[PDB]
Amino acid sequence: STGSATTTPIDSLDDAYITPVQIGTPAQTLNLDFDTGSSDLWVFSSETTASEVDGQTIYTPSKSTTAKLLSGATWSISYGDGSSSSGDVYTDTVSVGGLTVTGQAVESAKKVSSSFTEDSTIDGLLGLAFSTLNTVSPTQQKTFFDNAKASLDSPVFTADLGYHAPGTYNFGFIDTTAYTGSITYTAVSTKQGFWEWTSTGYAVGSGTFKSTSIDGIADTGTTLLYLPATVVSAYWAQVSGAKSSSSVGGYVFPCSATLPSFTFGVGSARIVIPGDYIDFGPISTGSSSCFGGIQSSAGIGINIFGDVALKAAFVVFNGATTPTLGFASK
Ligand SMILES: CN1CCCc2cc(CN)ccc21
């Protein structure tokens, strides 16, 4: 089997991407945020505290003839920014782009943090990291991809995120028309539950490539590119007037600036992030200070190749017995 679904930016900055997901029978379509940095499929639901729902589409398990309470199971996830959601668990039929999994754990939110309530376009997250990170207790549950894997033509999914435009998540096949050149594959460590890999270096604009190992994760659920402070300082030093602002929470730059590209290495290959992809717009409406798309990871504990980096590439998440990541230009 295969599946193919379009993923659409939630706003004009590409802060996140939503993909329609069919849950239950008859289908209830929710727009979920496919997250390769986490491993829970959770949704706003008829069980979510009413004051914490503000415009999201909800899953109502009592209206699905295939929903079944997973007795005794609860979940609770804290994200890296401090956001959180928790609740109970149903199993139900879940389909993405024509690919159907029966018995998928659908984690129904009873509580969500304000950051989620405020995002009316996101109806939940569909985790695509390794199932070892799934938070369901007392019986950990598998991700949608893990459940689908054996049925897929090939045990892979691909992320092809658009810049200011829709893109595609495919399951079970490589679309060889979706990228240019060849795909360069690189090793993955699953020891932390992430799609963790080592970039071979970077360049700023037309500058020379610096060969240096940068361990990080491929994370579709994070917006920005978080890299070591040395790398990030080298990037922003090429933007006149750019500076790190403790009050704003990162590097900012004059909105009148033209930003240089940023290149990262994948083995001997190179992925170029155009300068425009690094502009996240005014820090507040009407400001002439703009927020940068490359930020320091120093306070995180891990480097994160988020959407800023991934949308410059066609990315293969190869879930074979020994997983690997593939990157191609496009
Ligand atoms: C608060 N917020 C809502 C928008 C989508 C989303 C995704 C993640 C996963 N990195 C964390 C928070 C969050």
Side-chain angles (χ1 to χ4, degrees), residues 1-62 64-67 69-109 112-141 143-148 150-190 192-242 244-330:
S1 62
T2 64
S4 181
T6 298
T7 192
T8 301
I10 63 166
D11 63 24
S12 66
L13 297 178
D14 298 345
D15 282 318
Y17 298 79
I18 50 171
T19 308
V21 177
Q22 281 71 49
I23 308 176
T25 309
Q28 300 178 40
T29 298
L30 275 66
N31 297 327
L32 305 188
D33 178 356
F34 283 23
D35 187 357
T36 62
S38 70
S39 306
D40 288 49
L41 192 176
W42 74 260
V43 296
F44 279 79
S45 76
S46 57
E47 302 180 329
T48 309
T49 301
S51 66
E52 297 178 352
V53 184
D54 184 9
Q56 295 81 9
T57 294
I58 62 168
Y59 170 58
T60 303
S62 68
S64 174
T65 60
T66 44
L69 180 73
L70 186 63
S71 181
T74 60
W75 61 281
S76 179
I77 185 157
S78 306
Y79 293 97
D81 67 333
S83 288
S84 61
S85 46
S86 61
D88 55 14
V89 186
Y90 295 81
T91 57
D92 210 338
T93 301
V94 172
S95 298
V96 175
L99 169 66
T100 299
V101 168
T102 59
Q104 175 63 44
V106 178
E107 301 174 33
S108 167
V112 299
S113 58
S114 69
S115 271
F116 283 113
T117 301
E118 289 165 7
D119 194 306
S120 62
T121 53
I122 295 167
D123 302 325
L125 273 54
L126 189 151
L128 292 167
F130 292 88
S131 292
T132 55
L133 294 180
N134 176 267
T135 76
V136 176
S137 180
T139 307
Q140 189 169 63
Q141 301 295 303
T143 69
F144 175 82
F145 177 54
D146 252 351
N147 282 323
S151 306
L152 293 177
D153 291 356
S154 179
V156 306
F157 68 90
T158 64
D160 178 10
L161 301 180
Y163 169 64
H164 295 170
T168 306
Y169 282 101
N170 289 331
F171 291 84
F173 71 105
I174 305 304
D175 180 355
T176 62
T177 75
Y179 58 87
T180 64
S182 57
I183 306 178
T184 296
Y185 289 86
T186 196
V188 165
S189 173
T190 65
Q192 296 193 96
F194 300 119
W195 294 92
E196 186 171 358
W197 65 289
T198 302
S199 172
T200 48
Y202 68 97
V204 175
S206 58
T208 61
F209 187 84
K210 175 74 171 178
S211 292
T212 184
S213 295
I214 304 170
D215 298 340
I217 66 169
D219 184 4
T220 58
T222 287
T223 313
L224 304 187
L225 173 54
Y226 295 89
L227 291 173
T230 48
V231 179
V232 175
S233 182
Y235 178 80
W236 290 107
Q238 299 305 311
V239 180
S240 186
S244 181
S245 168
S246 54
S247 60
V248 175
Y251 281 87
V252 296
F253 67 94
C255 295
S256 60
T258 300
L259 296 180
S261 64
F262 184 87
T263 300
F264 63 95
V266 181
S268 56
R270 306 289 181 253
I271 300 293
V272 180
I273 305 172
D276 285 359
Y277 290 26
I278 299 162
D279 187 344
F280 278 76
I283 60 170
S284 296
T285 302
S287 178
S288 74
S289 292
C290 275
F291 198 68
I294 295 178
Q295 296 294 345
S296 178
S297 65
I300 294 177
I302 197 156
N303 300 305
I304 306 173
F305 293 86
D307 296 337
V308 162
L310 302 181
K311 75 191 181 182
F314 177 89
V315 187
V316 180
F317 294 80
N318 168 29
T321 301
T322 297
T324 64
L325 281 165
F327 293 82
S329 295
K330 63 185 186 192

